[PDB]
Symmetry: D2
Subunit: 497 residues, 4 copies
Amino acid sequence: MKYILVTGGVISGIGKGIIASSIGTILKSCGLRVTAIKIDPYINIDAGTFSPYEHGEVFVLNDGGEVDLDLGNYERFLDINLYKDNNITTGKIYQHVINKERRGDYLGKTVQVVPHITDAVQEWVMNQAKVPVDGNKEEPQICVIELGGTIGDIEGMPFVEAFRQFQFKAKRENFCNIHVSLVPQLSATGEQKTKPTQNSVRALRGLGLSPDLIVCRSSTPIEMAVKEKISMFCHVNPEQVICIHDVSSTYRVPVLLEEQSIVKYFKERLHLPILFKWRNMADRYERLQKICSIALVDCYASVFKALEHSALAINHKLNLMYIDSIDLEKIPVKFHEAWQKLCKADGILVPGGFLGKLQAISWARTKKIPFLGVCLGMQLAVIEFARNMRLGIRRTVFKTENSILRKLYGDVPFIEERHRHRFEVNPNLIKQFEQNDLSFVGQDVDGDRMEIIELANHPYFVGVQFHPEFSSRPMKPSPPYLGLLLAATGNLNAYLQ
Amino acid sequence: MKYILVTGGVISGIGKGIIASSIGTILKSCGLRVTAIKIDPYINIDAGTFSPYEHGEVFVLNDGGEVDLDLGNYERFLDINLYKDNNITTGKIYQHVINKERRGDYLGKTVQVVPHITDAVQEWVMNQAKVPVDGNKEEPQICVIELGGTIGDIEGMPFVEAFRQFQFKAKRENFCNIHVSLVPQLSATGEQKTKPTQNSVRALRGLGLSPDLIVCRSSTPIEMAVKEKISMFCHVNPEQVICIHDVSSTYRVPVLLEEQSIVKYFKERLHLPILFKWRNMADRYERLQKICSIALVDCYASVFKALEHSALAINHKLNLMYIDSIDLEKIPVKFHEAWQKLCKADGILVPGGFLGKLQAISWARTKKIPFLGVCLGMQLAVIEFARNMRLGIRRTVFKTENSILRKLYGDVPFIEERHRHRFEVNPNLIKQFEQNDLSFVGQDVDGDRMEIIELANHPYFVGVQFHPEFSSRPMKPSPPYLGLLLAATGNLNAYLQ
Amino acid sequence: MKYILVTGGVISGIGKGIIASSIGTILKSCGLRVTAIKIDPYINIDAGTFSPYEHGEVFVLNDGGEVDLDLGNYERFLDINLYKDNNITTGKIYQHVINKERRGDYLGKTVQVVPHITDAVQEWVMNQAKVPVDGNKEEPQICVIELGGTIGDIEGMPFVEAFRQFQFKAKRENFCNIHVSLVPQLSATGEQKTKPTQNSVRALRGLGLSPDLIVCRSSTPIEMAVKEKISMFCHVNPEQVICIHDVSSTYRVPVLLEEQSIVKYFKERLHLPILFKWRNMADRYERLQKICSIALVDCYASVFKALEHSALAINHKLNLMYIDSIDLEKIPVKFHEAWQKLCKADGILVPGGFLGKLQAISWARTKKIPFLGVCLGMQLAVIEFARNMRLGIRRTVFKTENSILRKLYGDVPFIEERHRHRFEVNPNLIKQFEQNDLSFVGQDVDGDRMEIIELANHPYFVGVQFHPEFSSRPMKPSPPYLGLLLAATGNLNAYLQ
Amino acid sequence: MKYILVTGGVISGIGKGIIASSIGTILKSCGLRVTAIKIDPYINIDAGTFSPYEHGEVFVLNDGGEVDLDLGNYERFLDINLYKDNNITTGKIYQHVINKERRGDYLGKTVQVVPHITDAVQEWVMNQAKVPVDGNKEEPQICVIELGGTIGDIEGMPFVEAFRQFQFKAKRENFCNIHVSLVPQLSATGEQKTKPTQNSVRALRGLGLSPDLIVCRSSTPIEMAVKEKISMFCHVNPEQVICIHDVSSTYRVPVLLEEQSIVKYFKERLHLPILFKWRNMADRYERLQKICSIALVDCYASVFKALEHSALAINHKLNLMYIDSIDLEKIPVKFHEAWQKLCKADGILVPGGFLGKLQAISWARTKKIPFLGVCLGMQLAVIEFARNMRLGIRRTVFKTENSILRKLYGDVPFIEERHRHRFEVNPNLIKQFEQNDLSFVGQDVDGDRMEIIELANHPYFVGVQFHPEFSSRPMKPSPPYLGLLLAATGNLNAYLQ
Ligand SMILES: CC(C)(C(=O)Nc1ccc(-c2cncc(C(F)(F)F)n2)cn1)c1csc(NS(=O)(=O)C2CC2)n1
Ligand SMILES: NC(=O)CC[C@H](N)C(=O)O
Ligand SMILES: NC(=O)CC[C@H](N)C(=O)O
Ligand SMILES: [Mg+2]
Ligand SMILES: [Mg+2]
Ligand SMILES: [Mg+2]
Ligand SMILES: [Mg+2]
């Protein structure tokens, strides 16, 4: 296969995953079948071990893998369905080698990091690159590998050593390395400094990989004198020093890379047989004037992106105002902030988790303000109506054609969406609710779990057990989120017509 | 506790384990309770995964741990009984952290090498240092930690980072580092080169540990000009540059270290409240003239050491001539080497394993030459008499007082020795042999396994199921090995009188 | 002596020289005699080799040394008079060792970087620290050594190796290291990243120096979670992690360091027997409302600082608008910018160099707007009146008591100021001017060079051959600059009364 | 041009200069014009600064350059005449850049190691490679550059950075790197260790150069398992792992390299349009039985080599027994060693320097034992007969045809040989000697200095002012040395016939 490693320098928050995902959609626009692998040098096996504050949200894959939000960036940019083994971690590879050792698979030889851990990385990358990750069963052409962390962190040392070897245990026609690095810009002088990028490239080149492209991330576009220092000290041509400055949106990052001519580089280097929409979406995003103010009651990064996809599609600006449920709760300055936000809420969003959510539900229910409840927001909705693990892709069957979500999903009798919940509605008690305004509208194939609710005597009050955020992509807004913004702007009855 | 790290430079075969074990017996001669821990940066969990060619023999511990022969060096020098967790490996620590992660013991935080793997090393070292490893239940005073590998190998990087932190997460009064390094001596010029030791100390000091002692291993004693270069370039006083040259025996290495005044250094540095036998044994070893030629039919390092302990005790030189059983086998130049060695064999030794052993057994049996069979050498002896896992410490009961091994072990009704076998003698068939010359003399407490055989109509033909090698120490020769050399020299009937 | 090394991490523009100069004035406020040495790892011998665009202005010392502007920061903060050998460079030290080699001073031994270049650094630092650099002939107590560059640049490697050795070839009571490092703050998230500081401290600690204080430079004050990561990963206590954020002025940086308690650290560590004005000047600077707009017709950093000292003393804000003389020149958008700036010029400043300066002189002369000409601005003033190396400290004698500059300098018959010029006024032609409005008012002791001019029929049009900028300090504004701001605000005749 | 860098790993005494010189004579046997440059990272400018104990003898070049003996190895192997600038040193390059800086040749830019010192290395290497260093005025085809020191020493860091850049600022067709490294062989086990070579290649590859050949120096030929570890861990094919073991002679080292097929590698890699004598000389050397015992009364490495060239040519073994003149002196165990050696002296050799030499002269003179005096040995000979700087190539004119040295040099009226002396014979006093047995036979063209003496009433007692050692090569023995061995074996009168 053809392989593109993306390494990071100086600091991890430079957006390497957006760059890597951007080059993947560039290559896809050039007609290529692109895979992605993310290396996360953490010793954790799956992101289910994390808090939402640590690594952002737990993105959920079709196979039930729990991963950090950057596999959602590859899914959203490439329109791809990743498997749990497209995330490589140090825990996953060390445990693999330890298990092989105990099985005698290393034939009584001493197991050690080089070669055995480095071979495990190569074995895994070669095979997961070949996985059909598009819906097309045809073997991929390119694999973009993001090496997470910063080159020079101790946890990354097996992977760069593996990738050093992988140059030679392949061809230069088949492997290149992108180094993404911070070019810090000083306050008082405006001066862009190249020293961290030079030092990071020196470290990377000391690990036996050379930058084939250097991607500068900078606050402002870099000056030619700055690009000249980088091309001289990092021993790469000026045409191989790319600048991605702070832009308006992720839609503009692929467009910017065409305007740095990366396709000519990848054609020449990787010997490749080679956007519109990203321009259009960027150009639209920069012109969004009509505010839709929604109350959310990187912890919710797919939720925010799903709303922005929906907002863009209806040519509105999202104003996502985040409210803690403890602010709305009876426990008082932040109460008069939170409830004031909840007054100017055109829609209420109660996402998942593991108290004032119930008050926001009551507010939305009573005042007839548009509501989307996801996972816990469905369960709390059922609960508060009464007062007044299941992991990965599953089929949800609609119990009727008289469903607003069914119209938004395109009249289909069932949907396949991603789940992540341990708790569900009691099958014996459903007959308390069916008599009244809260219809249970979607169920599993087993008929035990109700998985969608709709409140009938309301513009749009829906609850879903699945996370339809993980299915959201710019080209196809997540229908439960689209319905929320359509309802909040009154356009729902025009769309459903 | 007080801690002594022993790091290695340039190459691992410099004898760091003998140096570390030597300083342990020095400190023990100074009256201190000494523990040992060995770090082996391999990803293997236990040495049962190894061939005998890889890491030498599998030493067996009382608890059934399978470890490399260097935990036998700490056992033999200190008269200590190590536990399986006095061996630290990368596999054992990474699996520990992975298991803690999956249990949620890191409270949703990202697990990473620093701190979490480095803390696991510190946690383990602090607690295993406190283990009563002598028979005395009193908590130890010093722990000698040998860091296996060479400082600068990638697998060693978590451990040196842990030990860097461990300086500061302790006191300088409680931690020091010994660096053992090759001083190569060139052929043509006789010139001793200090450059590898300087470069290795620069690497070690780049990992945030400084040599408190530098132990030069050299072929010849080092010149003062060589010691001056090391003390200048490695930034350590001349009194802290120790030379251990190629000596006669391991008995001389502690004695040499007194003659480099290390006790004064450890008294001053570690604030310690502070040999004869090692001199005596060294002085004896250098005067061994009477050859006992024994045929063995680092793969057998405890076997060789057990014979040398026995040889020294009877003031004989061992000539251990190693013969492959395939040389003795019918499959022919090496046949006339092997059988010629077997002709001048004063004793035959058939150690354990997993064909010409049977011929050597037949030879020894028929010609009435002294025989010791260990594990497989007992099983093949039973088999060839007929023609003509159980792991760690177990109690073997003697079935009679009429046992030669029972006299050698001191008339005791049972012995406790170390086992490592999956196969044993059939309890139904023992009644074929008891009628004849092959007595089954030792059994387990269960009475199912016969564990010792003695052939009655022979000077000394014994078979044992245990490995009594692992019990051998210079002060107390292993009785089955002592019996072999006593028999082979005719001194048996004088000893047993 | 007591020594404080100040090392830099990530990027050089973090202000290490202001931090180092700030701790020097802190220690001086604590009553200590402080020296400064600046190491510049460039191979250049003196800054006379530089353009003004490269390293900023060439600061001139009393002995005629040409140095970068950071020796002016030590002069301005400490009220000190540095010698040319308080600047150490790689060129100065390598040439020293090469010269010693050729003289046989190394006694036929091979000269090499360690030890001989590292010893040369130590020799130089020990002796220049002892230099009376105050006017007091008493030997100094502390020496602040700024190591220029970033730790990990190849040119800095001799100096950090020297300073590693210098810890041990001294006492910990007598040496400490401050590491100044960038904590980059990301745009989108507001997130302060500690990774470069951790990596830079790892590099510094790999060169055998540990941070005794870590000084974070950040745009905003750092959060406690950020300070905790630094104190954990850089293995230093929280009290040793200092934050200097972007402040109003250099006057506030010493004041901030008291509010980080550095005096307690230096008392404890360096065993020291231990501001008001800096608070007052900072507090004043933040309240400057009255604008004095001056046209200047880091290239002029002492000029700008001299104006700011003058501005602060008269409680005005300086608006220094910089105009290129080529903009004012007949060669046209920038002409209407430049001449528009020159219209709102309350004073014209024509500093030194090596064309529209003559037009600005004519403008100021004719319209009677306050003028200060320095070096070339005196020579061009003489020239344009007619139309209508001498290096370091020299004595200039006033030819009369009827001098405005003589009143501003305190009625004294001569002044001693710093010179840097190859050209001077023709002694035969002076009699053309003395007849008219342009008096030559200051001369050298030789009587050949006129060194000050004053135009009599004007509020304030003075020219000086010396650079009185280099003499400017916050406590004592440079009288030619003070006169300019006093004239420009009309306060001159109140001051001279 | 084509360039071959030769780097060293682990320790400098591995013989890199003999390897580099050997590949140069291989390429010369393939018909190529070969240059050599030696980089010595010492800060010394010329070896005239050294003692003879430090870097061995001072080799003298035709232009009067004073250099270490390794430029004599390139002269002897290639039959080449090196210039003083074929030795590059850190002193020579830093002084060059400092001088350029002071001249303004860097146009006011900050001079720093990268680029300016690294460019100076490249500039120098490119131009000195083009120097006609053979007598043929045609521009060379290959330049062998030995980088002295060990890769990873701090002084070598500018040169490896220059050579990293030089790969890219050339072509792979035009540059390759040979890494020479110690494979230490342990005493007790016979085990050859690859770890230092792996670590040294990791350091070298961290400086951005990869081994194109790895030359193992080992005591014994390396095993295939050892070559496999090196080829795996150093990421080079088995055919690129060369072993040079301890051999009989330098004559065998080129022959060994053909038997490792290096010409096939250099043909393929450097795109080259491509021994007998070295085999013959090696084969002869191994069969030398007839001892010629000569008393010498790396300090004298060209002297020893000149004797060995002479010995080989007359098919004798040299037994060069070295005697200190202080042993022969009246100041007594070593007296009876020294004079005993002087009794079995078939020839006396008194080489140059700066007391018992006079006694050895008297001994040789009186007993009529063959004598060669060089420089000081001529001056002391003149002196002791009476009792009983001029640097580089100079023309010496023979005063007569009646000269034994003139016959040995081939009847020529003058010779051109290399000089290094400050003292000479007094022109007024020569008329004391000419009357008697000591003829002055060679003079300079000036007629002031007598430069050769011959004692007439003796088999062979010659003194020369020049060092004819530096002219010695295996193909053409130095005639004054050849005469000594011919005289000492009685073959002189057969040769001179
Ligand atoms: C939330 C929003 C509106 C967005 O653009 N935010 C934003 C804005 C700017 C940048 C940015 C600025 N400069 C540089 C770089 C980098 F590239 F260098 F890092 N990034 C990053 N994220 C959005 C809608 S859809 C989406 N993401 S998404 O669903 O994956 C879809 C793309 C496939 N985000
Ligand atoms: N210092 C300056 O401004 C230099 C002025 C002028 N070029 C001279 O040499 O006198
Ligand atoms: N080269 C030498 O042997 C030197 C000889 C003597 N010291 C001189 O200067 O002439
Ligand atoms: Mg810069
Ligand atoms: Mg040396
Ligand atoms: Mg972080
Ligand atoms: Mg090995």
